[PDB]
Design an enzyme around this catalytic site. Structure first.
Site, PDB file in Angstrom:
ATOM      1  N   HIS A  40       0.778  -1.249   0.000  1.00  0.00           N
ATOM      2  CA  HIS A  40       0.000   0.000   0.000  1.00  0.00           C
ATOM      3  C   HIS A  40       0.816   1.311   0.000  1.00  0.00           C
ATOM      4  CE1 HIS A  40      -3.417  -2.425  -0.812  1.00  0.00           C
ATOM      5  NE2 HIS A  40      -4.228  -1.374  -0.815  1.00  0.00           N
ATOM      6  N   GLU A  71       0.378  -8.092   0.588  1.00  0.00           N
ATOM      7  CA  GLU A  71       0.824  -6.796   1.150  1.00  0.00           C
ATOM      8  C   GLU A  71       2.364  -6.622   1.227  1.00  0.00           C
ATOM      9  OE1 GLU A  71      -1.187  -4.327   1.144  1.00  0.00           O
ATOM     10  OE2 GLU A  71       0.255  -2.851   2.029  1.00  0.00           O
ATOM     11  N   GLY A 145       2.673   5.434  10.834  1.00  0.00           N
ATOM     12  CA  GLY A 145       4.084   5.812  10.969  1.00  0.00           C
ATOM     13  C   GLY A 145       4.935   4.581  11.238  1.00  0.00           C
ATOM     14  N   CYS A 147       4.197   1.457   9.626  1.00  0.00           N
ATOM     15  CA  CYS A 147       4.128   0.532   8.503  1.00  0.00           C
ATOM     16  C   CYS A 147       5.505   0.318   7.913  1.00  0.00           C
ATOM     17  CB  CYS A 147       3.097   0.919   7.465  1.00  0.00           C
ATOM     18  SG  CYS A 147       1.429   0.520   8.007  1.00  0.00           S
TER      19      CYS A 147
HETATM   20  C1  G85 Z   1       0.696   2.169   8.004  1.00  0.00           C
HETATM   21  C2  G85 Z   1       0.491   3.022   6.728  1.00  0.00           C
HETATM   22  C3  G85 Z   1       0.157   4.480   7.048  1.00  0.00           C
HETATM   23  O1  G85 Z   1       0.754   4.970   8.026  1.00  0.00           O
HETATM   24  O2  G85 Z   1      -0.840   5.319   6.312  1.00  0.00           O
HETATM   25  C4  G85 Z   1      -1.304   5.184   4.945  1.00  0.00           C
HETATM   26  C5  G85 Z   1      -0.531   6.007   3.914  1.00  0.00           C
HETATM   27  C6  G85 Z   1      -0.630   1.916   8.737  1.00  0.00           C
HETATM   28  C7  G85 Z   1      -0.446   1.428  10.187  1.00  0.00           C
HETATM   29  C8  G85 Z   1      -1.806   1.182  10.872  1.00  0.00           C
HETATM   30  C9  G85 Z   1      -2.691   2.445  10.936  1.00  0.00           C
HETATM   31  C10 G85 Z   1      -3.441   2.392  12.270  1.00  0.00           C
HETATM   32  N1  G85 Z   1      -2.743   1.288  12.920  1.00  0.00           N
HETATM   33  C11 G85 Z   1      -1.766   0.735  12.313  1.00  0.00           C
HETATM   34  O3  G85 Z   1      -0.929  -0.030  12.809  1.00  0.00           O
HETATM   35  N2  G85 Z   1      -1.428   0.934   7.977  1.00  0.00           N
HETATM   36  C12 G85 Z   1      -2.613   1.270   7.401  1.00  0.00           C
HETATM   37  O4  G85 Z   1      -3.072   2.398   7.514  1.00  0.00           O
HETATM   38  C13 G85 Z   1      -3.442   0.243   6.626  1.00  0.00           C
HETATM   39  C14 G85 Z   1      -3.522   0.504   5.106  1.00  0.00           C
HETATM   40  C15 G85 Z   1      -2.108   0.699   4.576  1.00  0.00           C
HETATM   41  C16 G85 Z   1      -1.720   1.942   3.996  1.00  0.00           C
HETATM   42  C17 G85 Z   1      -0.410   2.127   3.512  1.00  0.00           C
HETATM   43  C18 G85 Z   1       0.522   1.079   3.630  1.00  0.00           C
HETATM   44  C19 G85 Z   1       0.191  -0.166   4.203  1.00  0.00           C
HETATM   45  C20 G85 Z   1      -1.133  -0.345   4.657  1.00  0.00           C
HETATM   46  N3  G85 Z   1      -4.827   0.246   7.067  1.00  0.00           N
HETATM   47  C21 G85 Z   1      -5.120  -0.201   8.276  1.00  0.00           C
HETATM   48  O5  G85 Z   1      -4.249  -0.614   9.028  1.00  0.00           O
HETATM   49  C22 G85 Z   1      -6.562  -0.218   8.726  1.00  0.00           C
HETATM   50  C23 G85 Z   1      -6.747   1.003   9.607  1.00  0.00           C
HETATM   51  O6  G85 Z   1      -8.063   1.537   9.389  1.00  0.00           O
HETATM   52  C24 G85 Z   1      -8.657   2.304  10.473  1.00  0.00           C
HETATM   53  C25 G85 Z   1     -10.149   2.392  10.127  1.00  0.00           C
HETATM   54  C26 G85 Z   1      -8.505   1.587  11.830  1.00  0.00           C
HETATM   55  C27 G85 Z   1      -8.033   3.707  10.510  1.00  0.00           C
HETATM   56  N4  G85 Z   1      -6.909  -1.386   9.553  1.00  0.00           N
HETATM   57  C28 G85 Z   1      -7.844  -2.286   9.235  1.00  0.00           C
HETATM   58  O7  G85 Z   1      -8.500  -2.140   8.212  1.00  0.00           O
HETATM   59  O8  G85 Z   1      -8.152  -3.459  10.075  1.00  0.00           O
HETATM   60  C29 G85 Z   1      -9.492  -4.027   9.956  1.00  0.00           C
HETATM   61  C30 G85 Z   1     -10.186  -4.525  11.241  1.00  0.00           C
HETATM   62  C31 G85 Z   1      -9.823  -5.772  11.857  1.00  0.00           C
HETATM   63  C32 G85 Z   1     -10.436  -6.268  13.030  1.00  0.00           C
HETATM   64  C33 G85 Z   1     -11.454  -5.492  13.611  1.00  0.00           C
HETATM   65  C34 G85 Z   1     -11.832  -4.255  13.030  1.00  0.00           C
HETATM   66  C35 G85 Z   1     -11.219  -3.762  11.846  1.00  0.00           C
END
Ligand code: G85
Ligand code: G85
Lengths: 188, 188
Positions: A40, A71, A145, A147
């Site tokens: 991503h 991923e 931050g 990832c």
């Molecule tokens: C790292 C990437 C980044 O910083 O921003 C995007 C440019 C980031 C790290 C996570 C964010 C919050 N907690 C973390 O550890 N990863 C992401 O944002 C994921 C998408 C991604 C973007 C870019 C590179 C790699 C990955 N998305 C998620 O982690 C996502 C977070 O969504 C919210 C709604 C919580 C903000 N998580 C998710 O979809 O998990 C689903 C879930 C599972 C079980 C119960 C409920 C929901």
């Protein structure tokens, strides 16, 4: 305890800060000029590596035989330095683990270690609406931050951080066979 | 290497998350119900400790004999648990140190370790326009959210994080004599 010495040896010799259109990510270099970054991150034709613009010679977004996202993106880079070969530190197989450390190398956090405890082979994940396979999970509130952060135990590099929900974090697995000198077919 | 095992023993048994009107801070508990927090946290009559509202029985903003800010506030708290007594881990004197770790325990980062390298007895600091004395300095870009973070070397708890400029961080020193069972005069 957690294998801090080991996590730190990996951070010191095998990580760089990578910046894409999507932001900064900890980047694990694996063996020559080959590194990994979460799919991503949206890697294009060029990438900033420790703020230096670098040609991306090859980028493979890993999917499995069900054609589902893993991923991981393996990138081949146009740089002068080789990375120390750490393929022997990679797990052969899917597994569960104890007492992992998550490490981060970004501009914001050039050197940072978080014990995330126990790591479970979790499998399916709806990662921000992308179905994803082969995820490791730990009960630790990971944040944006982090990832690309490198998940280790002593002697093993097991994954890179890719997601979380406020209470758990998720890493995409690394397996030894992702990186073995291989055979020849058209990948793009 | 850095004394990670040691930093982690201190974080496990001797830190709590403290929230004031000013935000959250890593809080080092020192001996009974006595803890420290940076003076700029602005401690009042009550304080949240791991989200539990807690009466602050006493708060001393340390200043030196030139009447300059030391950026340490010693707080006595109304809690049931005692803290493990870690006064023997405190430096007797001002010193310089090698290979320190900075540790943070907040809601955002419940457990986090940063090697900051070498720690120099720095002295004077204009801390956000407050003149401050007796500061330790390390060459590491520390950030907001780390104030109150605990700076250790193996076997020594040397300070708590209080400031930075984007390239260095600053901790206010801890000395053993800050915490010795003493004599009786009016402190407020
Ligand atoms: C790292 C990437 C980044 O910083 O921003 C995007 C440019 C980031 C790290 C996570 C964010 C919050 N907690 C973390 O550890 N990863 C992401 O944002 C994921 C998408 C991604 C973007 C870019 C590179 C790699 C990955 N998305 C998620 O982690 C996502 C977070 O969504 C919210 C709604 C919580 C903000 N998580 C998710 O979809 O998990 C689903 C879930 C599972 C079980 C119960 C409920 C929901
Ligand atoms: C911790 C407190 C917090 O998070 O916010 C206030 C509620 C925070 C940690 C530092 C911030 C940036 N880097 C850090 O490591 N500390 C502070 O913000 C300091 C004041 C304070 C508030 C609350 C509790 C304890 C302390 N202020 C500074 O650190 C200050 C930062 O100012 C800016 C302009 C850089 C944002 N630093 C400073 O004044 O250093 C002076 C200096 C020295 C040498 C060359 C140039 C400038």
């Amino acid at each position: 305890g957690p294998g801090f010495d080991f996590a730190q040896a990996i951070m010191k010799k095998n990580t760089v800060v990578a910046r894409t259109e999507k932001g900064e990510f900890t980047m694990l270099g694996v063996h020559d000029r080959v590194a990994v970054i979460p799919t991503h991150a949206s890697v294009g034709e060029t990438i900033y590596i420790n703020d230096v613009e670098t040609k991306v010679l090859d980028a493979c977004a890993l999917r499995d035989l069900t054609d589902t996202n893993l991923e991981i993106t393996i990138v081949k880079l146009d740089r002068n330095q080789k990375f120390r070969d750490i393929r022997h530190f990679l797990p052969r197989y899917e597994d569960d683990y104890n007492d992992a450390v998550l490490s981060v190398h970004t501009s914001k956090f050039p050197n940072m270690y978080i014990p995330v405890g126990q790591v479970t082979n979790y499998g399916f994940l709806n990662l921000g609406g992308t179905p994803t396979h082969r995820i490791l999970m730990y009960n630790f509130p990971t944040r944006a931050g982090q990832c690309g952060g490198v998940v280790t135990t002593t002697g093993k590099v097991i994954g890179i951080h890719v997601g979380g929900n406020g209470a758990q974090g998720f890493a995409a697995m690394l397996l030894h066979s992702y990186f073995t000198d291989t055979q020849k077919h058209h990948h793009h």
